[PDB]
Each structure stands twice: as C-alpha cells, then as structure tokens.
Design an enzyme around this catalytic site. Structure first.
Site, mmCIF file in Angstrom:
data_model
loop_
_atom_site.group_PDB
_atom_site.id
_atom_site.type_symbol
_atom_site.label_atom_id
_atom_site.label_comp_id
_atom_site.label_asym_id
_atom_site.label_seq_id
_atom_site.Cartn_x
_atom_site.Cartn_y
_atom_site.Cartn_z
ATOM 1 N N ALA A 1 0.848 -1.182 0.000
ATOM 2 C CA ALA A 1 0.000 0.000 0.000
ATOM 3 C C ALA A 1 0.887 1.237 0.000
ATOM 4 O O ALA A 1 1.351 1.677 1.048
ATOM 5 C CB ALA A 1 -0.903 -0.010 1.228
ATOM 6 N N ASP B 1 -3.548 -7.543 -4.248
ATOM 7 C CA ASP B 1 -3.567 -6.086 -4.369
ATOM 8 C C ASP B 1 -4.462 -5.560 -3.251
ATOM 9 O O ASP B 1 -5.416 -6.231 -2.849
ATOM 10 C CB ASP B 1 -4.136 -5.650 -5.724
ATOM 11 C CG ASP B 1 -3.130 -5.782 -6.860
ATOM 12 O OD1 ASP B 1 -1.963 -6.149 -6.603
ATOM 13 O OD2 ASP B 1 -3.513 -5.509 -8.017
ATOM 14 N N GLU C 1 2.964 -8.968 -14.383
ATOM 15 C CA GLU C 1 1.945 -9.935 -14.779
ATOM 16 C C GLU C 1 2.364 -10.742 -15.996
ATOM 17 O O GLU C 1 2.020 -11.922 -16.118
ATOM 18 C CB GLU C 1 0.627 -9.224 -15.073
ATOM 19 C CG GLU C 1 -0.523 -10.164 -15.354
ATOM 20 C CD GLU C 1 -1.836 -9.425 -15.458
ATOM 21 O OE1 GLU C 1 -2.141 -8.894 -16.548
ATOM 22 O OE2 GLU C 1 -2.551 -9.359 -14.436
HETATM 23 O O1 LIG Z 1 -4.732 -7.313 -20.409
HETATM 24 C C1 LIG Z 1 -4.098 -7.302 -19.127
HETATM 25 C C2 LIG Z 1 -4.600 -6.100 -18.324
HETATM 26 O O2 LIG Z 1 -6.023 -6.194 -18.150
HETATM 27 C C3 LIG Z 1 -6.566 -5.027 -17.507
HETATM 28 O O3 LIG Z 1 -7.993 -5.150 -17.411
HETATM 29 C C4 LIG Z 1 -8.645 -4.666 -18.596
HETATM 30 C C5 LIG Z 1 -8.699 -5.736 -19.691
HETATM 31 O O4 LIG Z 1 -7.373 -6.045 -20.128
HETATM 32 C C6 LIG Z 1 -9.510 -5.237 -20.890
HETATM 33 O O5 LIG Z 1 -9.637 -6.287 -21.852
HETATM 34 C C7 LIG Z 1 -10.904 -4.799 -20.431
HETATM 35 O O6 LIG Z 1 -11.625 -5.923 -19.922
HETATM 36 O O7 LIG Z 1 -10.776 -3.793 -19.412
HETATM 37 C C8 LIG Z 1 -10.073 -4.265 -18.249
HETATM 38 C C9 LIG Z 1 -10.056 -3.160 -17.192
HETATM 39 O O8 LIG Z 1 -9.359 -2.019 -17.701
HETATM 40 C C10 LIG Z 1 -5.980 -4.906 -16.098
HETATM 41 O O9 LIG Z 1 -6.479 -3.727 -15.461
HETATM 42 C C11 LIG Z 1 -4.451 -4.854 -16.163
HETATM 43 O O10 LIG Z 1 -3.920 -4.889 -14.836
HETATM 44 C C12 LIG Z 1 -3.920 -6.054 -16.952
HETATM 45 O O11 LIG Z 1 -4.214 -7.252 -16.231
HETATM 46 CL CL LIG Z 2 0.914 -9.089 -4.838
#
Ligand SMILES: OC[C@H]1O[C@@H](O[C@H]2[C@H](O)[C@@H](O)[C@@H](O)O[C@@H]2CO)[C@H](O)[C@@H](O)[C@H]1O
Ligand SMILES: [Cl-]
Ligand SMILES: [Hg+2]
Ligand SMILES: [Hg+2]
Ligand SMILES: [Hg+2]
Ligand SMILES: [Hg+2]
Ligand SMILES: [Hg+2]
Length: 265
Positions: free
Chosen positions: A61, A131, A223
């Site tokens: 945080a 998170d 990620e």
């Molecule tokens: O693609 C990896 C990222 O995803 C993000 O979430 C997005 C998603 O990718 C998109 O397809 C749509 O569903 O909107 C989502 C929210 O913005 C994550 O926020 C990011 O951390 C990656 O994991």
């Molecule tokens: Cl984590």
C-alpha cells in the site's frame, strides 16, 4: 506426519455425478480448478487445522493506496481464512497511516516500511499475495492452499490463447508465442508455499532485470512474467474468477455462484 481425521458426516461423493457440468474443474496436468461446489470446506478445514496451518497475506500500500487498507483488512477479517492462523504483512511508505483494524484471535498484523524474507519461512506455511484496492465479499479459505497457485484473470477466462495479452515480443523474457499458453493469470492474486512463492518472485525479479538491461519492458510488467513463469512451472491449483472479480465491469454471470474477492469501485 498427517494426523487422522475425525468421524465426519457429510453427503457421499457420487462417482457418476459430475461436480460442475458447466466448467472445467481440473487442468490437463491434474491441478484442481477451484469453483464453488467442487469442495467440502468442512473436510478441508479439518485437514489444515490438524496441521496448525498459518497463512501469510501480503499487500503493498503505497501513496494514495493506503486509503484502501481499512476496507481490505476489515473484510479479510470477515472472509479470509477465518478459523485459521493468519499473519498480515502490510508493506507501506506510510506506517503511521495504517488504520487500526480490530483482529480476531489467532490473527496478527505486521507493518513493514518500504525486511528479511527468511522471516516468512519461519513465520508462515503459505503466502498469499494480493492487491490492496480490493475487498472480500465472500469466503476465501483453505481450498486455495497448495504449493503454487495462480488465478484466472476475470477478463480472459473464456478467451482463446491467441487473444491473451501475453508479452508477444521474442526480445522479452516474458515472451509467449501464439501457439502456447494454458490460461491468462492475473498478477493481483497468486500464492502457495513460502518456498514456491519466493521462487516465483525471484524468477520474476531476475527476468525483469534482464529485460531492463535489454531495454525492454513487458506489455503488462510483472503480470507478463508471472504468466511466463506459470506456463513453464504449472500451478498445483488454479483459482476461478470467483476469486478475482469486478462486478462493475463484468456484472454477475451465472457461472459464478459466488463473488469472493472484488475490485473496489
Ligand atoms: O490485459 C491485461 C490487463 O487487463 C486489464 O484489465 C482490462 C482488460 O485487459 C480489458 O480487456 C478490459 O476488460 O478492461 C479491463 C479493465 O481495464 C488490467 O487492469 C491490467 O492490470 C492487466 O491485467
Ligand atoms: Cl501481490
Ligand atoms: Hg461437486
Ligand atoms: Hg535476509
Ligand atoms: Hg508475496
Ligand atoms: Hg518482478
Ligand atoms: Hg511474478
């Protein structure tokens, strides 16, 4: 040495009656995929309590994110590993800003300003890394514990691998070609034994340092590397999207009987 379970009365599992007919409950490498209905929490609680299992939950945080700690901790107290020994580790740049949350018995919290990670090995049996800008809304218990687990990203659980947002440039250590990949795991919820979690974070750190030295940064940072690691080191359990959801963005599909850990609006 695992002690014997006591007499227990519960519904007999039925060999000729599938658990869930709407979803995949086991991976091709025989790792359970955790969905509501696949586990008897009473049996699992007994197994882990008899082992006096201690679960460490870590969260970072920083800056404005300290504002999410109160709801995160309060809801974890209501839904996370209730009945088991829990040790929260809050890594923050504002130790004095950590809210004073009331904890149940057998649960403790350590505030670390940003220690000896060897401490994890002697203090907990499992490490769960999540998170902080989230809240628990339903049960998240021992059914998730295993040597190494990843969680299905809520935006791609029904997507084909070519659509996965893996790092696609071969110049990166997190590179995964279009014909490879099992699932797209979200970096916001992973864990396992202390040993396996440290192996994973150690691998991620080294791979990212290599990319930096090569002047490249994976499309989705940590990620991307998490996905590369879990592709080559299959998790022993995979958590369904029940464990990482965003109702505002994705609603509540029938396939999800419970929404356990969600993003805060
Ligand atoms: O693609 C990896 C990222 O995803 C993000 O979430 C997005 C998603 O990718 C998109 O397809 C749509 O569903 O909107 C989502 C929210 O913005 C994550 O926020 C990011 O951390 C990656 O994991
Ligand atoms: Cl984590
Ligand atoms: Hg079942
Ligand atoms: Hg150390
Ligand atoms: Hg962690
Ligand atoms: Hg990393
Ligand atoms: Hg990682």
């Amino acid at each position: 040495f695992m002690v014997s379970l006591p007499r227990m009365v519960y519904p007999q599992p039925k060999v000729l009656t599938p658990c869930r007919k709407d979803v995949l409950v086991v991976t091709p490498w025989l790792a359970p995929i955790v969905w509501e209905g696949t586990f008897n929490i009473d049996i699992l609680n007994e197994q882990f309590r008899l082992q006096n299992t201690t679960i460490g939950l870590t969260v970072f945080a920083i800056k404005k994110y300290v504002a999410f700690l109160k709801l995160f901790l309060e809801t974890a107290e209501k839904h996370f590993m209730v009945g088991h020994r829990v040790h929260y580790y809050v890594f923050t740049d504002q130790p004095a800003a950590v809210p004073r949350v009331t904890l149940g018995t057998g649960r403790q919290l350590s505030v670390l300003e940003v220690f000896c990670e060897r401490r994890f090995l002697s203090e907990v049996d499992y490490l769960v890394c999540v998170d902080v800008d989230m809240e628990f809304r339903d049960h998240v218990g021992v059914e998730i514990l295993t040597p190494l687990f990843g969680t299905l990203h809520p935006s791609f659980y029904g997507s084909s691998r070519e659509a996965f947002t893996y790092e696609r440039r071969p110049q990166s250590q997190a590179y995964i070609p279009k014909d490879e990949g099992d699932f797209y795991y979200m970096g916001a919820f992973f864990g396992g034994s202390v040993q396996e979690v440290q192996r994973l974070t150690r691998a991620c750190h080294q791979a990212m340092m290599v990319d930096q030295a090569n002047g490249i940064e994976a499309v989705w940072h940590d990620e991307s590397h998490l996905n590369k690691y879990l592709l080559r080191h299959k998790p022993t359990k995979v958590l369904s999207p029940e464990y990482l959801w965003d109702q505002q963005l994705l609603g509540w599909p029938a396939v999800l009987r419970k929404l356990r850990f969600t993003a805060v609006p």
